[PDB]
Amino acid sequence: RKKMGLLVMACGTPYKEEDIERYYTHIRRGRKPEPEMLQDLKDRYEAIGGISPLAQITEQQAHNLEQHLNEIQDEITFKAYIGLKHIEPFIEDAVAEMHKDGITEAVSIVLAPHFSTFSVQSYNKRAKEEAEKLGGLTITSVESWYDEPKFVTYWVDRVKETYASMPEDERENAMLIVSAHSLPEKIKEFGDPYPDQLHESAKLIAEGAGVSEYAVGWQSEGNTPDPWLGPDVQDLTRDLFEQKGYQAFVYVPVGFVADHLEVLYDNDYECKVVTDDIGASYYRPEMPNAKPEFIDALATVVLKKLGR
Ligand SMILES: *Cc1c(C)c(=O)n2c(=O)c(C)c(C)n12
Ligand SMILES: [Mg+2]
Ligand SMILES: [Mg+2]
Ligand SMILES: [Mg+2]
Ligand SMILES: [Zn+2]
Ligand SMILES: [Zn+2]
Ligand SMILES: [Zn+2]
Ligand SMILES: [Zn+2]
Ligand SMILES: [Zn+2]
Ligand SMILES: [Zn+2]
């Protein structure tokens, strides 16, 4: 069998409370969070059940993906390597370990289904530049996979279950909000297809689920002076309610693939704050995490990228 590195990339999460400072310092481009912000972040991680389970999920996704890929075909033996953006093991650490282990050929995938120049493209550029610095190693990189039918089907089935679980009047008066992580609006000056891909995710999921009333929103924007992609899910929820009085809101943060603060808090608390305030029911179906259906979707994405 041909041996191939499987480079699984993701944002990264702190591994313990004491990593919060350095993690967010990395996110803030060297700017250490002020003490009140550090304390608030600790409170938030404690409120959603703790950091450790969150940090486990990328590991489980990569290892299940490796094993499942090695099981469903017989030509390639994959070895998974995790490269993270904002905490060790960094992308360059992962590429360097692949080089050390004798890997000469690798396929990479970012655990984010939509391409953007800010995230996926930069992950891929960092991996490929480390590989070319070290030499003797090439990487073929998945760039987007939001339209993989098995992944669409994951979210379609979750949405169908959520709508079927509703009371009749909720089911008749509900709103589906499909969201991804906001980015600076300036990405549009490069023709970044990220917004169009999020809209396409929302179209495909709503269509598959039979949900005719849905909206596209953004979440987790930063505070840079430049405008970020909007509307934010909080404002969009309040605004849609003020237009049409929906009694239930279903949040599908399709841009995220795992439980993390920006879902468990930014949706299950902040959006929940808004729905509770307007008297609407809140629903947020399970994130893919390392569930077998999602891992099979990722394995299909990888094998298709390799033309197998
Ligand atoms: C950490 C992280 C995740 C998971 C994600 O989707 N995004 C973004 O879009 C940014 C900008 C960052 C950071 N992250
Ligand atoms: Mg301790
Ligand atoms: Mg494509
Ligand atoms: Mg926020
Ligand atoms: Zn980032
Ligand atoms: Zn591992
Ligand atoms: Zn399997
Ligand atoms: Zn070397
Ligand atoms: Zn739109
Ligand atoms: Zn963020």
Helix 20-27 vs helix 35-47: crossing angle, to nearest 10 = 110
Q: Is the CB of 112 under 6 A from ligand 1?
A: yes
Contacts of 57 (CB under 8 A, 6+ apart): 258, 259, 260, 289, 290
Question: Ligand 7 (ion): which residues have CB within 5 A?
Answer: 68, 71
Place of tokens 């600790």: 42
> Which one of the ligands is nearest to 178 CA?
9
CB count in 10 Å sphere of residue 24: 17
* Method used to solve the structure: X-ray
Distance of alpha carbon 304 from alpha carbon 308, whole angstroms = 6
Reference 202, options 225, 175, 169, 220; nearest CA is: 175
CA of 35 to the centre of ligand 9 (A): 38
Q: DSSP states of 175-218 as a string?
A: EEEEEEE--BGGGGGGT--HHHHHHHHHHHHHHHHT--SEEEEE
- The helix or strand, by DSSP H or E, that contains position 99, with its residue range, turns out to be helix 91-100
253: left (phi over 0), alpha (psi -120 to 50) or beta: beta
> Which one of the ligands is nearest to 236 CA?
9
CATH of segment(s) 149-283: 3.40.50.1400
Break the chain into its structural domains and give their ranges: 2-144+290-305, 149-283
CA of 6 to the centre of ligand 6 (A): 11
Q: Which fold has domain 2-144+290-305?
A: Rossmann fold (3.40.50)
- The helix or strand, by DSSP H or E, that contains position 94, with its residue range, turns out to be helix 91-100
Going by the DSSP 8-state scheme, the letter that residue 248 receives in this structure is E
The three-state secondary structure class of 111 is: coil
* Contact yes or no for 111/257 (Cβ under 8 A): yes
